[PDB]
Structure formats: C-alpha cells, structure tokens
C-alpha cells in the first residue's frame, strides 16, 4: 500500500474499499499497490486466486480486468515495524521487499 | 475454537437455505433443483479450522413433461436453453415454456423477455441460419397475392 | 392465412453451454451467461446436441419433495450438533473467565 | 472428385452347407462418416468415453 | 431465513385459492379457468432468495356448447367475445351469451 | 367463430383436475409449513443458548 | 502431555447416488490425482467433477483431473505416458475412409 | 484497538409482496433520491411511498 | 383517466454511487451523500448499471 | 366505485399470513430479549470487578 508520504507500507488485512476516483484502498483510507481502478459502471468484482482482478460491465459480453494483485515477501518478517491501522514497514532486519504473483 | 463451529453452523445454515428454496419452488415450471457444495479449510495446523461453502451447484435434470393444451408452451427434452432479450439488450437462457403473445405481437415469456430466433427474409420467406437471433414477432398485416410464375 | 397458405415467422433458436453449472441465475427462473458457464453456442431443435422441442407441453420442476423432506431433517439434526459445540466452547470460556 | 475408398474385403468364417437358404449372417466396416459431439460420459473402468 | 418458506406458503396459498374459486365457478357460463403462474427471485447470492407468483394465466379454451331451448340465449364458438356497455358508457367483454 | 342460437357455453372447469391440483398444492402447503417449523426450532436452539 | 499427532480415518463413506454423469465415486482404496494451476499434484477423494471454460474435467476448486492420454487413430490409452489433464473437445470428428471390410 | 470504521453490507434484500401499488421494490443497484423541506438530498432503498 | 387515455406525470430517478459505503446515514431508512461516496450518478431504473 | 345491494364487505384478513407473521415477531422479540440478558451480564462484570 502507497502512504501519503509516498513511501510503501505492507498490510494484510485484506477489507478493500473504493474511494470517490473508482480505486482501491484499504479500509483506512490508503491506496494499495498496484493501482487497480475500478469503473464507475461495475457489476461485480472477481479476484481471482492468483491476484487477477476483473469486472464484468452491462453489454459486454466479456469481463474485463482492471489490474493485478501481488503479495510482497520478506525473508525476516518479524522485523518489519508497525505504525499502526494494521500496516507494517521495512526495516534492514526484514529483509528486503520481493513481490512475486499470489501463487508463485 | 469459536470460528470452527461459526463456519459449520453457517454451513448448515446454508445448507437448510438452499432445501427451503427447493421446496418452495416445488412446482415451478423450468426450476432446477440446487445442492450445496462444501469443503474444508486446513490452514497449517492439523486441527481442521473449519468448513466453508464452495459454491451451489444446479441439477440440471430434465422434469416431467406435462400436457397443459395451449399452443405457446414448448418444453425442451434433453439438452437447451430458449434464449431471451430484455429491454436493454441482454441476453439471458431459461428452460421455461409459458410464452405469451404482447401487444406488440411479439413471443415473450410471463416476465416480459422477448423470445429470439432465427427471422425469416425473402419471398417466399425462409429460415435464413446465417444471421444473429432476432425477437420473434407475429404481425396481422394481411399477406399479398402472388401473380403466378409457374404452373 | 385465409387463402389457405403457411407463411414462416421464424424458427426458435436454442442455446448450449460448455458448463451449464457456470450459469448464474438472475431470478425470473432464469439464467445468465458467464465466463464460467463458456460462450453460448447457438443452433436448432433436433441438431447436433439439442434435443426436441415438445410443443404444447411444459416442463414441469426436478425437485422430489419426499427427498428434500427427508434433507431437512439431516441438516437440522446438523445444525443442532454444531450449537451445541458453539455452547460447549461457551462454557469453556466461562470456566477459564471464572478463575 | 473424392479419393475412391480402396478396402480389403474378406468373406473370413464363411460356410456353405445345407441351410434354409441363402443367408448372410453379419457384415462389418471400419470407416465411418463426419460426426460431432453429442454425449460424455465416464465409464465403470474410469474411461471417459464420447459418443 | 423466514423469506424463502414464507413466500413458498404464500404461494401455495394462491395457488390452493386459485383452485378454490375454479371448483366454485364448475357450472358456470362464460367462465375461463386460471392457473397460477411461478418465478423464482435468485438476488445477488446463490441461496435461493424464495419464490413469487408472476400472475394468473387464463386457459381460453371453448366449453361444452349445451342447449338450453330458449331463442335468447347465443354461444359463441372458437374465438371472439361479446361487447357490452355500462351506464356510464365503458365498454367491456363477456363469452356469457345469455341475454334478456 | 359463427354463433349457436338456443345455446349456452359453459365452463372449460374439469372437477377431476381441480380436485387432484388441491390434493398436490395442499401437500406444498404442508411441506412449506414443515420449512417453517424447521426454521422455528433453528431459532428457539440458538435463543435457548 | 504431547499431542503426538493427528490421525485421518481413512474408513469407506456411504456412495450416494446424484444422477450427474460427471459424478463418480471410489469404492475401497485408491485417490484422484489432480494438478494445480501452478502444476502441483495433489490427490483427493471428492468426485464433484465439472466441465470447465476450456473443455477440462475439474473439481469444485478448478483442480484439473489427470489420467492417462488418448492417442492414434483409433485413439487407445496410453497406459506408457505419463498422467495428463483430461480434456473433452468439441471439435468435429473427421471421418475415416474404409480400410476393411 | 481503534474503531477502523463502521462498514454497511449493501447487499440485496428478500423482495417481500405486499401487494399496494404505491410500493417500489429496488433490484440489483440503485436508489431512491429524495428531498425534505430544506431541499436536503438524500437516498433510501425504503419502497413504501404515500 | 375516464376519457380512455392516460399521460405520464414523472419518471423515478434512481442514484448509483461509486462507493456505496462511504455513505452517511442520517436514520429514517435514509442516506446523505458524502466526500467518501462522491458525487451521485443519476439514471432510470433497468438501464446501463441500473 | 359501485355499491352493490344485498351484500356485506368482509375484512380483508388472511389468518395464515398473520400466523406466520406473528412467529416471527415472536422470534424477534425473543433475539432481542436476548440482547437485553447479554447488556444485563455486561454490566453486571463491571459493577462486580
């Protein structure tokens, strides 16, 4: 997730919500990476077990995906240091951040 | 501890949800029974954290096919769906035979949707496979003679 | 027609899906195609895999009463079990509270 | 203008005494015409079959 | 949830009424039998939400045509209706010929 | 259609289908009625809890 | 006191019949053998086998069911190859021009 | 802990017949738009209209 | 009407968000726009998202 | 609209419908003295303590 300072946080409580632009955030307020923007005109949201976002729209006939979810790893994930609304952020004891595909 | 009977008894829940339908579409033309579908959810330990719903799964089984005498029901024996437009366009399936003629002279089912198929172009008309479904319509307007071309 | 003459209006379509269990149901005893269910592949009554079409005839429900009555009672039986773990975990809470 | 089918035909296992009249018993092919797929299913054995 | 039994009962109920008033009306002149008509009402979730009645279907098949000897008194075969008046000048329709 | 004279048209009402449609929707009825006994007791567990 | 470990009763369910041709049911011993869309294997014993989009056998999940291939003209099971998702095409199926007769 | 928010569950309700033609039932998405004497606007799923 | 034709009075607007959540519920079975719902997006009833 | 002569009006009161109905307001009253008993051990803990 993206803090408004511009610096990356890592959450994982996973209750999403959409802001008044259409995007992801988490239920703090805060926008998580990478951006997924979904449409005004959605039906339903599908996301799928690899991360893969999509929406289905009235009249099209297929669904469409709005972005990709990936899951960032840490080789130490004790040292990561909470600033509270249940996010973490890196520190030279949590390794570094390696984002791979939920599944990979 | 707690969520491992919340989740079983949200299944159960769900299960006797999915019977209470099932009973009270008991006589309803073009239902298909529904069953419950469920699945455990190991998480690391050993202890089986508990049991989730994996989804509704249809039976899609053919009902009897009874005698009702009217012109415009239709039942679809094996394998089919009639095909369906709405207002906005969309298209939908449904195994359903109560077709009613509009006022517009249109076959549309109970619930408005407009039953499509192949139209008919041409003097004389015929089926013509090569284009998209249309909705299927009746007009009275009266039909023309035909001058004879062969005898 | 009145000069005893047959004029073609249109033939019914039928459609078929890859998955039928992928449709989702919108109510109205009616489904809606999905990605899940596959593109519906269209075609006419008594060809390649669609069978007749019955006229004057409806097709009735596949739900069997005498099954889904005895269903219920298994899953009320079920439910009932699963309570009593959820009160069984209630006294354990309140044994551990109490001390 | 089709390639003219070209087959070994045999009258294997065939008899000739003194029956009630001239009779053929069974006769079998192995070619068959274009088909599409009408029906699966999974047999006893665990063979998934397409008829 | 109550939803889905309530509305099965409610249905069944219209359909046992509709069946009622049928036998009631057996020897009547001019009168059309009925039958409830069912739609299921799946919302959102896969559950099943219940059932509704999606109306009343008329069965406009002609009855036994039975003499009854006086001249006033017209039956109307296959398709068409009588057209009547009010006081009050609407105009309605009726398949019962029996007239003075 | 032309019209009969001297003739009435009476109800297209067969008794014997009606009176097998009762016995069925009453079964319906019962079967509902049952659903909601089920649904009572589910209710009166967990309140009793 | 230890929890020494916990032990699955592999004991035979009751076989239920459903009526679905996709439906089937191990008597006595033996698993499925399913892959992941990752290409890990993996064995159940659940038989609610659906069609998918592409025409493969897949469980509840979307675990393909794997088996023996089909190949040659007529196609025959190649008890010598290795597992492999199974599939059911629609695609049309070409004719044979006779050979024996 | 902190109250990260209080979050509604807007999903579709049983539609139940009632049977007055002044009541509107709301499938799928979508709301009622009303004004009071203010001029306030405001939305409600609630279909029972006098 | 009693002269056998009828005349349209109004049509219902219905009002889709894009974040249904955000919504400020002021009681009533009633709801208020606000800067977490955003704007409302009005429409009639069975059409686009509707 | 018309009077008719000779006839009565009846309520139009369907006692199935209110049965049920009363179940279930029975079932909710019941839910919420439910709630009532759990407010009820709440404050009790706490006076205690």
New interface residues.
Partial sequence: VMLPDGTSAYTRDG?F??????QLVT??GFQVQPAITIP????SITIG??GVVSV?Q??QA??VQVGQLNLTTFMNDTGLESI???LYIETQSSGAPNESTP?? | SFSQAVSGLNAAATNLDVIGNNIANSATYGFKSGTASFADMFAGSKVGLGVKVAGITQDFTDGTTTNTGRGLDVAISQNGFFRLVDSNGSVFYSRNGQFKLDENRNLVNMQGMQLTGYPATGTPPTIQQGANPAPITIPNTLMAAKSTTTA | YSNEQEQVLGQIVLANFANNEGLASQGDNVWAATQASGVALLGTAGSGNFGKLTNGALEASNVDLSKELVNMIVAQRNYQSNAQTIKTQDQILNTLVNL | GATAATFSLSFLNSMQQNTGANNIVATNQNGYKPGDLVSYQINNDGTVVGN
């Fill in positions: 209750s919500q959409v802001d008044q632009n259409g239920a703090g005004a005109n959605a039906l077990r690899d289905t009235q009249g297929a669904p509270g609304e249940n599944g990979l």
